[PDB]
Amino acid sequence: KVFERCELARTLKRLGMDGYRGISLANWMCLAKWESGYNTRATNYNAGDRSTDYGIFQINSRYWCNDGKTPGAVCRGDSCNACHLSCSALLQDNIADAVACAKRVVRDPQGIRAWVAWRNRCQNRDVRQYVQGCGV
């Protein structure tokens, strides 16, 4: 599914993303915009390291979900699939699982810095435009 901007903002607000581990809803919106253009079925293979990015947030397979096909990995406990999900779950139209996984991502030290796209296009920028007029 390709979300409309305000429709996603209201969805994320309902799912408890506003202010989660200190990240404003606007930051999440900025992230989804630049990562996938708000498209849940987006996939990107990293030929360079054989990992794949999945869904609206472009979550990487090396540490967060299991796709079976991601090499460079020494798996301690749940270290290779910290969200406890098949990567397939990050490609559904319903973003509940994707959101639970993004929340797990930011529980690690880097927080939102986990996404290179955020560093480049969102950090220290006026992200208010992403949520203006959405009623959130």
Ligand X SMILES: CC(=O)N[C@@H]1[C@@H](O)[C@H](O[C@@H]2O[C@H](CO)[C@@H](O[C@@H]3O[C@H](CO)[C@@H](O)[C@H](O)[C@H]3NC(C)=O)[C@H](O)[C@H]2NC(C)=O)[C@@H](CO)O[C@H]1O
So which residues are the catalytic ones? 35, 53
Cβ within 8 Å of residue 89, ≥6 positions away: 65, 97, 98, 101
- Residue 62, binding choice from ligand X, Cl ion, none, Cβ under 5 to 8 Å by partner class: ligand X
In the complex, minimum distance from the CB of residue 125 to ligand X, in angstroms, rounded to a whole number: 19
Residue nearest to ligand X (CB): 60
48/135 with CB nearer ligand X? 48
116/132 with CB nearer ligand X? 116
> What's the CA dihedral at 53, 55, 61, 64 to 10 degrees?
140
- Residue 98, binding choice from ligand X, Cl ion, none, Cβ under 5 to 8 Å by partner class: none
> What's the CA dihedral at 103, 121, 1, 91 to 10 degrees?
-50
| Residue 127 in contact with Cl ion, rule: CB under 5 A | no
Length reported for the chain: 136
